[PDB]
Design a protein around this motif. Structure first.
Motif, PDB file in Angstrom:
ATOM      1  N   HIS A  93       2.101  -4.030  24.329  1.00 33.97           N
ATOM      2  CA  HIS A  93       1.010  -3.285  24.948  1.00 33.97           C
ATOM      3  C   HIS A  93      -0.333  -3.649  24.331  1.00 33.97           C
ATOM      4  O   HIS A  93      -1.348  -3.696  25.035  1.00 33.97           O
ATOM      5  CB  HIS A  93       1.265  -1.782  24.841  1.00 33.97           C
ATOM      6  CG  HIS A  93       2.570  -1.347  25.432  1.00 33.97           C
ATOM      7  ND1 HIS A  93       3.313  -0.307  24.917  1.00 33.97           N
ATOM      8  CD2 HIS A  93       3.264  -1.811  26.499  1.00 33.97           C
ATOM      9  CE1 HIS A  93       4.408  -0.150  25.639  1.00 33.97           C
ATOM     10  NE2 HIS A  93       4.402  -1.051  26.606  1.00 33.97           N
ATOM     11  N   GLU A  94      -0.367  -3.910  23.021  1.00 32.25           N
ATOM     12  CA  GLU A  94      -1.612  -4.349  22.400  1.00 32.25           C
ATOM     13  C   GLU A  94      -2.079  -5.675  22.991  1.00 32.25           C
ATOM     14  O   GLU A  94      -3.259  -5.842  23.328  1.00 32.25           O
ATOM     15  CB  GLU A  94      -1.430  -4.464  20.886  1.00 32.25           C
ATOM     16  CG  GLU A  94      -2.483  -5.315  20.195  1.00 32.25           C
ATOM     17  CD  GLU A  94      -2.546  -5.063  18.701  1.00 32.25           C
ATOM     18  OE1 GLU A  94      -1.487  -5.123  18.042  1.00 32.25           O
ATOM     19  OE2 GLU A  94      -3.655  -4.806  18.188  1.00 32.25           O
ATOM     20  N   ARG A  95      -1.155  -6.627  23.145  1.00 36.67           N
ATOM     21  CA  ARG A  95      -1.506  -7.915  23.732  1.00 36.67           C
ATOM     22  C   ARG A  95      -1.925  -7.761  25.187  1.00 36.67           C
ATOM     23  O   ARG A  95      -2.860  -8.429  25.644  1.00 36.67           O
ATOM     24  CB  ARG A  95      -0.331  -8.884  23.608  1.00 36.67           C
ATOM     25  CG  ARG A  95      -0.630 -10.283  24.115  1.00 36.67           C
ATOM     26  CD  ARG A  95      -1.679 -10.960  23.248  1.00 36.67           C
ATOM     27  NE  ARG A  95      -1.937 -12.331  23.666  1.00 36.67           N
ATOM     28  CZ  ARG A  95      -1.297 -13.391  23.192  1.00 36.67           C
ATOM     29  NH1 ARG A  95      -0.349 -13.273  22.277  1.00 36.67           N
ATOM     30  NH2 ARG A  95      -1.617 -14.599  23.646  1.00 36.67           N
ATOM     31  N   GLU A 122       8.421  -1.141  18.030  1.00 34.00           N
ATOM     32  CA  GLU A 122       7.471  -2.123  17.515  1.00 34.00           C
ATOM     33  C   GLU A 122       7.181  -3.211  18.545  1.00 34.00           C
ATOM     34  O   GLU A 122       6.017  -3.584  18.758  1.00 34.00           O
ATOM     35  CB  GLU A 122       8.001  -2.736  16.219  1.00 34.00           C
ATOM     36  CG  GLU A 122       8.096  -1.754  15.063  1.00 34.00           C
ATOM     37  CD  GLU A 122       8.642  -2.394  13.802  1.00 34.00           C
ATOM     38  OE1 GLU A 122       9.054  -3.571  13.863  1.00 34.00           O
ATOM     39  OE2 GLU A 122       8.658  -1.722  12.749  1.00 34.00           O
ATOM     40  N   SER A 163       5.007  -1.976  21.120  1.00 33.15           N
ATOM     41  CA  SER A 163       3.672  -1.747  20.577  1.00 33.15           C
ATOM     42  C   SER A 163       2.839  -3.022  20.611  1.00 33.15           C
ATOM     43  O   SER A 163       1.718  -3.031  21.138  1.00 33.15           O
ATOM     44  CB  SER A 163       3.770  -1.202  19.153  1.00 33.15           C
ATOM     45  OG  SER A 163       2.485  -0.925  18.625  1.00 33.15           O
ATOM     46  N   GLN A 164       3.375  -4.117  20.059  1.00 33.56           N
ATOM     47  CA  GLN A 164       2.613  -5.365  20.133  1.00 33.56           C
ATOM     48  C   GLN A 164       2.481  -5.869  21.567  1.00 33.56           C
ATOM     49  O   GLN A 164       1.459  -6.477  21.907  1.00 33.56           O
ATOM     50  CB  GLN A 164       3.186  -6.478  19.243  1.00 33.56           C
ATOM     51  CG  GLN A 164       2.956  -6.306  17.737  1.00 33.56           C
ATOM     52  CD  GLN A 164       4.081  -5.610  17.011  1.00 33.56           C
ATOM     53  OE1 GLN A 164       5.207  -5.569  17.491  1.00 33.56           O
ATOM     54  NE2 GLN A 164       3.780  -5.054  15.842  1.00 33.56           N
ATOM     55  N   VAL A 194      -3.371  -5.121  26.510  1.00 33.43           N
ATOM     56  CA  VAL A 194      -4.711  -4.539  26.496  1.00 33.43           C
ATOM     57  C   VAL A 194      -5.747  -5.608  26.173  1.00 33.43           C
ATOM     58  O   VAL A 194      -6.815  -5.671  26.795  1.00 33.43           O
ATOM     59  CB  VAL A 194      -4.774  -3.365  25.501  1.00 33.43           C
ATOM     60  CG1 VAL A 194      -6.217  -3.043  25.138  1.00 33.43           C
ATOM     61  CG2 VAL A 194      -4.079  -2.142  26.080  1.00 33.43           C
ATOM     62  N   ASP A 195      -5.444  -6.467  25.196  1.00 32.82           N
ATOM     63  CA  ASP A 195      -6.381  -7.527  24.835  1.00 32.82           C
ATOM     64  C   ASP A 195      -6.599  -8.503  25.988  1.00 32.82           C
ATOM     65  O   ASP A 195      -7.733  -8.923  26.247  1.00 32.82           O
ATOM     66  CB  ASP A 195      -5.886  -8.269  23.593  1.00 32.82           C
ATOM     67  CG  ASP A 195      -5.696  -7.350  22.403  1.00 32.82           C
ATOM     68  OD1 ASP A 195      -6.470  -6.377  22.271  1.00 32.82           O
ATOM     69  OD2 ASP A 195      -4.775  -7.600  21.598  1.00 32.82           O
TER      70      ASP A 195
END
Lengths: 246, 105, 344, 163, 53, 166, 53
Positions: B94-96, B88, B91-92, B98-99
């Protein structure tokens, strides 16, 4: 940490002191601390307040901020001493008070009970204490005085006589050599028995069979080493061994 | 076996008429007896300590093996859980990432 | 008044009364907190206070007030801390650590230290020496060893000490100059006792009444022993590997004191042994070889210490054997009522 | 089965359980036949590949590749009766000890392991030489080699007590 | 997975056997009672050392 | 009574194993007179030279009733050695590391921690009953290091814990 | 840390009773050994419960 963060925690210490005062004298007298549970929670609160104020007064590089902190730290320590003495008086005179239950209830450790020693009790007088110790050591060397006794040792006793020591060493060595001879004779007898059994069975240990046995033993030994190392790694991974610090 | 721990009331009177040679002989005999008792006590303490070691070790090794197994299993399945937390968190993360890389674009 | 304070300091250093404080810490006295002391009071058992609690209480009573002049002026003024316990329990270590942490002068007026020094009427003179020097150069602490012998007045036990001058020679002057202290002077009196129960009858009252705070410092428990053993090895520069059978060692060393185990470990660990510790870590049978020549503390000594504890006022009031000993109780009232009822 | 397992002491049962659970990572109570030999060796035994395959055929009759703890225990009860002794290992080494001088050359022993018998891999032989020729003199003292392979396997507590 | 306490509620009843007077009873039963007490003490010591480790 | 009985039983078993170890032929139940001195010491005790001479004389006297000259019977050897062990004479019981370290300090008054092997050889061979050169070389193979120094502490520990079951 | 019961003054010489020769010991001796074993078992159980809590 960041210096602004340390200033922030000093501010938080100030609000915590204010809140402790307010809790001591709340607008509702019924909410005032009456029992040892509430008073001991308040005491732990001042303990942590003085802990972090002490750390801040140690670590700030600002002169005036530290000068302001000195009064706060001294006052908080003295207040906590008053609280400690008063709680000992209300605890039927016992100078030692047990807070493990309260610490577990409040989710804190026994290490909180360890009141820290302020560093400014010694650091501020570095040169003066240096001169005092210099005077102590100068007087000590002038008057040739002996210091505190060293750590005691088991008084095994005075050494035995030369001849008696020689004699008992002689018997001890003869006994050790007799035991060594017995062990060697036992090993030789086992070897002879195994070889005689092999001869009677008609099985002579060939080079191939010897290599097989030796390689099996070597595989067992190396696999034991690798298993121990991988088990150690699993210990330190799942939390059973401390990893070697780098 | 005379119990030396019980002082006989009246033994002090015998010492009054003891000659110097007899006093030295008695002192030497008492010293030899005291040293023999001390060495026997030292031997007994070493034996008792070793036996108390072994009896404690007799329980200790088997009990520790069982403990090692049981909490090995327990905190093995505990270590199973933290992998999901890593999943988890990454996951967050890598999401951050990417953003924020998109913002730099 | 005609003697310079520096000359008094030099003479006190020369006579072995004023000595340099060694660099030790209160945390050198290892141990683990009592994890059910409160549960023991719940079950109506008075636990031996944990050494963590002992350090906390000693710090709050002495180090924190003595450290700051501003604090000591207003905090509850504690003048005497009573440290009584068995032999090699760490009383000297705690005293030295507290003195070093407070940065205070150390004036040793123990009877053994002062034997042969200032005999006769000069026993009154040494007290003024020490008190004036302490007042001038606060913070300062006056240390007494075997305080149960200072207040003793029995002649037989005083002579049994083998002293050319009785240990009670400093009693009257100590009592007289003690009352001259005031808060803010940063002068403390600390005593270490091995058999505080020795004072009996008339001496018992003069003994107990002089110390304000009664600190009971007991032997380490099982976890505290498990902490003390590797700590003592590290202090003597030894180390026990990860697979050392520390649990069994502590269980079989149940009843041993911190200083006694320190002495045993010092005896066991030689320079060659330290050099070969990497080649051979210390084994429990190796420990037991030395430990056989080590006598543990007898149960009678601990029971007498417990009786002295029970006689100390707080739990003396607890155990319902005595009314609260307020300082306002004038002696003589109890005797007069009993003695005036048989003349009619 | 029960008669064979009754020869097992509770300490032996606990040790076998620990060895089994070390490679029973999933906790299902079974270990793979490939890790089966590794568990064999973790207990001090030195099984050959042929013996391992034979006992896999004997016990793992269903061919699932996994053998459980009771079968592990009966296998232990069967095979510890014939554990190779240090005397037998030394008798094996003196076959290659041509000179009878108490040591075998490191290169000669490497060639023995890489050419004769169940061939040991080059890295295995490298570890063997590194842990035997500790001083790096090129000579392997097979007596001390037997001693240190037997060490850590057969009840080191017994060696502690036999002092 | 520490063993559940559904053994203590039975062992407490099992350990309360014959707490009465031993006056006048035989040497043999005295020997068996000594053996049972030795077994109980050894079991208590074993469990104590177990959970102490 | 039972503890005395099983103490006697363990002593008898130890002596029987010691005799079997030095048995001349498997099942012959005979031990050579020259191998008796080592077998006697193999029982975990180290009696003095005079005591060994006394034991040898007693065994010879007991064997005089038999025709086996130069060899000692199992029953007689068991009887003698088990008698000596059962009566638990203080001479048979081994000394501790404390007394060994005490005595080993006599030859090192300077407290260097080590003793010269060459000087210790001469002391042993010229004082007390004369030690032989073969056993002298054997013992300096163990206690003497490459520098000829005998660090007496580890040798004392070895002489304390060499076969000392507790 | 088992609670120090007041009355254990006489248990020091009773806990040193040898486990051997149970046969041949008188009725009083066997009763004393029974009491010693009971006291030791109680001490061990209290010690175990102390570790438990």
């Amino acid at each position: 940490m960041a210096n602004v963060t340390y200033d922030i925690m000093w501010r938080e210490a100030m609000m915590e002191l204010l809140d402790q005062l307010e809790a001591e004298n709340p607008e509702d007298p019924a909410l005032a601390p009456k029992d040892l549970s509430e008073w001991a929670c308040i005491y732990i609160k001042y303990l942590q307040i003085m802990r972090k104020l002490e750390t801040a007064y140690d670590q700030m590089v600002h002169p005036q901020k530290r000068q302001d902190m000195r009064k706060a730290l001294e006052a908080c320590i003295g207040r906590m001493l008053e609280i400690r003495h008063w709680m000992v008086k209300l605890n039927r005179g016992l100078d030692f008070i047990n807070l493990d239950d309260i610490l577990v209830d409040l989710k804190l450790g026994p290490e909180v009970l360890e009141v820290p020693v302020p560093k400014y009790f010694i650091e501020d007088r570095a040169k003066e204490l240096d001169d005092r110790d210099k005077f102590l050591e100068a007087l000590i060397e002038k008057y040739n005085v002996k210091g505190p006794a060293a750590s005691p040792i088991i008084r095994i006793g005075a050494p035995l006589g030369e001849d008696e020591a020689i004699l008992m060493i002689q018997k001890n060595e003869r006994g050790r050599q007799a035991r060594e001879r017995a062990r060697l004779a036992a090993i030789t007898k086992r070897q002879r028995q195994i070889e005689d059994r092999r001869v009677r069975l008609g099985v002579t240990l060939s080079h191939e069979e010897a290599a097989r046995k030796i390689q099996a033993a070597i595989r067992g030994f190396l696999w034991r080493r690798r298993i121990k190392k991988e088990a150690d790694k699993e210990l330190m991974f799942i939390g059973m061994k401390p990893k070697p610090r780098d | 076996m005379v119990k030396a721990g019980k002082k006989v009331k009246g033994a002090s009177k015998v010492r009054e008429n003891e000659t110097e040679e007899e006093k030295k002989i008695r002192l030497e005999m008492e010293a030899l007896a005291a040293d023999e008792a001390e060495r026997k006590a030292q031997e007994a303490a070493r034996v008792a300590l070793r036996e108390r070691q072994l009896r404690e070790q007799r329980y200790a090794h088997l009990n520790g093996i069982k403990i090692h197994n049981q909490w090995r299993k327990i905190m093995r399945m505990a270590k199973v859980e933290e992998l999901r937390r890593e999943i988890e968190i990454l996951s967050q993360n890598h999401e951050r990432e990417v953003d924020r890389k998109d913002a730099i674009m | 008044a005609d003697r310079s304070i520096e000359s008094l300091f030099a003479e006190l250093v020369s006579n072995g009364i004023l000595q340099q404080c060694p660099h030790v810490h209160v945390r050198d006295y290892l141990g683990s907190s009592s994890f059910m002391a409160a549960t023991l009071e719940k079950a109506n058992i008075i636990p031996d206070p944990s050494m963590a609690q002992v350090r906390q209480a000693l710090t709050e009573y002495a180090i924190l007030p003595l450290g700051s002049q501003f604090i000591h002026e207003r905090a509850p003024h504690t003048k005497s801390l009573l440290l009584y316990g068995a032999e090699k329990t760490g009383k000297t270590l705690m005293a030295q650590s507290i003195a070093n942490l407070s940065g205070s002068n150390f004036f040793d007026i123990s009877p053994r230290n002062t034997d042969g020094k200032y005999p006769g009427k000069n026993v009154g003179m040494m007290v003024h020496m020490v008190f004036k020097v302490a007042r001038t150069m606060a913070p300062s602490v006056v240390y007494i060893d075997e305080a149960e012998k200072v207040f003793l007045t029995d002649k037989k036990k005083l002579k049994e000490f083998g002293s050319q001058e009785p240990f009670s020679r400093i009693k009257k002057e100590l009592l007289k100059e003690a009352k001259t202290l005031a808060p803010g002077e940063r002068v403390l009196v600390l005593g270490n006792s091995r058999e505080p129960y020795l004072c009996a009858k008339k001496d018992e009252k003069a003994f107990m009444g002089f110390w304000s705070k009664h600190v009971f410092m007991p032997l380490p428990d099982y976890a505290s022993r498990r902490i003390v053993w590797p700590g003592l090895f590290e202090r003597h520069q030894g180390r026990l590997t990860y697979e050392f059978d520390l649990s069994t060692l502590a269980h079989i060393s149940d009843g041993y004191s911190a200083g006694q185990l320190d002495m045993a470990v010092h005896s066991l660990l030689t320079k060659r042994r330290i050099e070969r510790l990497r080649a051979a870590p210390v084994d429990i049978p190796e420990i037991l070889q030395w430990l056989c020549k080590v006598e543990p503390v007898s149960r009678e000594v601990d029971e007498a210490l417990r009786k002295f504890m029970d006689k100390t006022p707080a739990m003396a009031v607890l155990k319902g054997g005595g009314k609260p000993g307020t300082a306002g109780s004038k002696p003589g009232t109890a005797d007069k009522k009993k003695k005036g009822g048989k003349k009619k | 089965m029960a008669a064979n397992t009754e020869q097992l002491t509770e300490e032996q049962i606990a040790e076998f359980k620990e060895a089994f659970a070390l490679f029973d990572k999933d906790g299902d109570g079974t270990i793979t036949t490939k890790e089966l030999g590794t568990v064999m060796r973790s207990l001090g035994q030195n099984p050959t590949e042929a013996e391992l395959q034979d006992m896999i055929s004997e016990v793992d009759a269903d061919g699932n590749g996994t053998i459980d703890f009771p079968e592990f225990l009966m296998l232990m009860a069967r095979k510890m009766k014939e554990t190779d002794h240090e005397d037998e290992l030394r008798e094996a080494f003196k076959v290659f000890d041509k000179d009878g001088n108490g040591f075998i050359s490191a290169a000669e022993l490497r060639h023995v392991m890489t050419n004769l018998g169940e061939k040991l891999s080059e890295e295995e032989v490298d570890e063997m030489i590194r842990e035997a020729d500790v001083d790096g003199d090129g000579q392997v003292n097979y007596e001390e080699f037997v001693r240190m392979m037997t060490s850590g396997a057969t009840d080191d507590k017994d060696k502690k007590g036999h002092k | 997975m520490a063993p559940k306490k559904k053994g203590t509620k039975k062992e407490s009843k099992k350990d309360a056997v014959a707490t009465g007077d031993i006056e006048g009873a035989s040497v043999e039963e005295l020997n068996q009672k000594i053996g049972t007490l030795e077994k109980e003490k050894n079991k208590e010591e074993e469990y104590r050392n177990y959970m102490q480790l | 009574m039972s503890k005395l009985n099983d103490k006697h039983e363990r002593v008898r078993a130890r002596v029987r194993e010691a005799f079997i170890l030095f048995e001349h032929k498997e099942g012959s139940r005979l031990v050579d007179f020259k191998d008796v001195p080592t077998a006697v010491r193999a029982c975990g005790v180290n009696p003095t030279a005079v005591q060994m001479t006394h034991i040898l004389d007693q065994l010879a006297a007991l064997n005089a009733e038999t025709d086996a000259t130069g060899y000692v019977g199992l029953e007689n050897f068991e009887l003698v050695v088990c008698n000596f062990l059962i009566q638990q004479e203080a001479s048979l019981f081994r000394d501790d590391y404390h007394t060994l370290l005490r005595a080993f300090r006599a030859f090192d008054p300077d407290g260097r921690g080590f003793i010269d092997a060459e000087s210790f050889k001469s002391l042993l061979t010229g004082k007390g009953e004369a030690l032989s050169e073969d056993e002298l070389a054997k013992m300096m193979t163990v206690a003497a290091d490459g520098e000829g120094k005998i660090w007496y502490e580890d040798y004392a520990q070895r002489l304390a814990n060499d076969g000392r079951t507790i």
